[PDB]
Amino acid sequence: RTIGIIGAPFSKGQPRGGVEEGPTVLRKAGLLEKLKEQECDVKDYGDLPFADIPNDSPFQIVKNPRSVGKASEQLAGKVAEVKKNGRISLVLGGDHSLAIGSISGHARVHPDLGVIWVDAHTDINTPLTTTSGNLHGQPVSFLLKELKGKIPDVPGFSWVTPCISAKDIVYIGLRDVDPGEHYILKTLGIKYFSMTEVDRLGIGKVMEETLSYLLGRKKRPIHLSFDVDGLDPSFTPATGTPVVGGLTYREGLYITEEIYKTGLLSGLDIMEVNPSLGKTPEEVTRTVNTAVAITLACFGLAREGNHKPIDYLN
Amino acid sequence: RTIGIIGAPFSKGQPRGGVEEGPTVLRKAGLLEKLKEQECDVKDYGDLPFADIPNDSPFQIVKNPRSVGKASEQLAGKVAEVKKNGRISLVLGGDHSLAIGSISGHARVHPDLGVIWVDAHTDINTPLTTTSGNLHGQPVSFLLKELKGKIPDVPGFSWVTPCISAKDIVYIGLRDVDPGEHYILKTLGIKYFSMTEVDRLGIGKVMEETLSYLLGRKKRPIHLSFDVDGLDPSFTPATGTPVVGGLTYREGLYITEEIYKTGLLSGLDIMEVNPSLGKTPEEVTRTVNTAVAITLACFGLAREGNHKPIDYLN
Amino acid sequence: RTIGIIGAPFSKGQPRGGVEEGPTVLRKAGLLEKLKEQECDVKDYGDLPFADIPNDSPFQIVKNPRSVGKASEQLAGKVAEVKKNGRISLVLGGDHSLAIGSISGHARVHPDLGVIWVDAHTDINTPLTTTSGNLHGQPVSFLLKELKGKIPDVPGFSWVTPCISAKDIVYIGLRDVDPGEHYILKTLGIKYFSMTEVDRLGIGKVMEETLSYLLGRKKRPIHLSFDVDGLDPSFTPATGTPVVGGLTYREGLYITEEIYKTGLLSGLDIMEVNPSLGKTPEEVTRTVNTAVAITLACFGLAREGNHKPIDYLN
Ligand SMILES: [Mn+2]
Ligand SMILES: [Mn+2]
Ligand SMILES: [Mn+2]
Ligand SMILES: [Mn+2]
Ligand SMILES: [Mn+2]
Ligand SMILES: [Mn+2]
8 A cells, every 4th residue: 555645835726825834744744754654655756846827817706727727737747647656646735726636637547536525615616606716615616527517717727627427526524515515516416424414423324324325336446635624623723714513533533544444545635734824833733743643544554553464472 | 484583681590690691792793694694584572671670589598589580471471472473582591590481481372392401401400409599490390380389489480380291391411410300300201311312322313312202293393492501611611500521512503403404493592601701702702603603503504505496506 | 339449659650750649639639528429338448558669670671560560469459358348449540550450359359350441552561562661551461361471470470360361351442552462452352442443333332332242141240440541631631641532521421321330340440640740730630520520420420410219309
């Protein structure tokens, strides 16, 4: 279970700046070393070098589109590379707009992939339904075959081809969904477990049905796109758009332990960690440490413990 | 789903004073505007003007009885008005002694009502079992037909007629119950889900059985009497009698989302918020914001999202 | 349901010193009085007087063994005394190394006992698998018949005879398990509910299966060994080895309420509370108060309430 680490220091999918240093403080927290400490085969693909696009006026109300466009383009390129090298891509973000490129590149090599999207938001606004203009609240609308016809030609995104259908994604953690997003939800019959459903069924059943929903017809590669604001701000405060009543620390680890155990994790996104928004030094390390813990769980770290197939009573 | 807002600035059901400003900071938090922002039809019935009763010596050990008596009397009057105007009554409290009047007036128009009581306490002490004397720990004993004969004539309450039987109420959130209260519980076979039961079954099953218990024989109006100390002090610290190990934020929203969905909510009480007891400015807004969130959930606000029956892909 | 209180002010099972004042601040928090306030028959057996062993060089990498050895020896003596006096032994700790003596003495009188071990750790390292050397991370390895042959002769422990088999213990709360410990887990087929399992099934089912697992073949005495770091550091911060993602306050009370209700509690350990490690005065009282609450729940205190078999409507 080989990993390809890709740093994605990008922020122009939303207004607040420090999200670009995500790949930096996660790497600083010893992520790749802890992974190696683990069962893991790790190749760092470096931090993608996102060059400035000084001339990038809004498209309608949509902000920084060529910048967001080219950065997902780039990242799409690199993820397909890692996938073609037979490794799980690990995208360190960066705002969630980058999902467009991550899922795009993943599907060029693994078009049958299914998506698990862990988030307080659905990020499925379209350019015409967005009210904020921020592209990190839009990536899913770009990716869905069914929203084909409803995505205008936004500069920076002409390279995009929708690569997943409504039935191939599941949301977990929702609690701040716009009304046009919800319309889209219900209209395309997308499968979701909002905090209501997690409260109702418990994370165990949620994950049962999630995996069953995506793999019951047949095993397929999984892309886990994790926005750390899916977890409660008591666990990941340093993030741009926090919303109270989230997934616990425990629920976050449960989600990823189960995914790990499928053996089918193929692409992972760790997004929206913004150290500059912690209100304290401790809020920063709390958020980083949690994103680290979620990431390690994705690659075999288990709370019941782990050992090698060796005899430990020597 | 039309609402009648009634402010009830009363505190003499217990010792600490600031609970009287509940209707004020909730209104300040933009409650009625958020409701309108929502699907809602809102008529403010004003803040009931509770006049002083300077001559109000204890009855035995029972404190401020004429004051508590007349204020519930008044409120009873006004709730029946709102109900007769075809709207859900929304009582902003105020201490929980006011439940006496709220449920009383509700039942004059809807005698078949069932009660859901969300609270860390059972508030079913009688004047002869109370040890504190505080009437906000007694309202249920006044209301129950079966405790008829065990409620002495307390001044200020001669207008009262018990309007609900033991089988028409359910408790959720209990964790601080006196021994005479528990005797009463078991003796009249009252249905309850204490924190033990919520932990055992989960809030999903709790609400399943609660609704089934009250409506399984036949649909009927519901009175939800919510004491914000039913939720954990980490969520509603600014309250007179906090008790650790409470209902989460999530559980609080779950409870009310399910009630909302019955379509049968008929009377709501939002009680015991006391801004003057927050230990900090933030403890005050945390409590207010939570009571607001619980209140909005009661009237259709859903975490999975909401939209109008319109086509949002225009 | 008669109790024998035994203070065990010992710390040399691990490095940090203040754990020795556990029996002191718990007693200070009014533990025995609250127990008496409860349904309980309480005899204080005093604080065992652990004398210095100045000459106590490591055994290999294992630290303070004669000291740890004699103190468990002593405690073993006293617990058997309390048990032979027909009372539940209540050991106030002290580090968790003392479990060796507590379970040892308990089994001299009740060899058929079953063990519930509530902890973030398995404490089943052997002297040859320990990496730290600290004996409070080893007590289970000493006690298990199946690890017979793999425990070298450590000075201070020659009095020990393994008294429980792999099948007679259940773990609840695990989240920091070494790889040799996990090997042992899987190898001897020990029954455990790690935080993963608690998240998956919920504490209700966990306790169902735990009790069923230990008593389904036949009723037997239960030894509950509770390490307060099994609960989340948000509830018991003043402890030597905290680990995030633990059992809630609620889960902690649920665990013990169910055990209480078996009627079979026979030995209880309340361990690893270290007031000197709270970061604040409040962190100390928070930890103490929680350990108190867990302890009272073990002896009948119920969140739904309690009353005497008397008529309270007089
Ligand atoms: Mn989000
Ligand atoms: Mn997102
Ligand atoms: Mn209460
Ligand atoms: Mn109340
Ligand atoms: Mn431990
Ligand atoms: Mn331990």
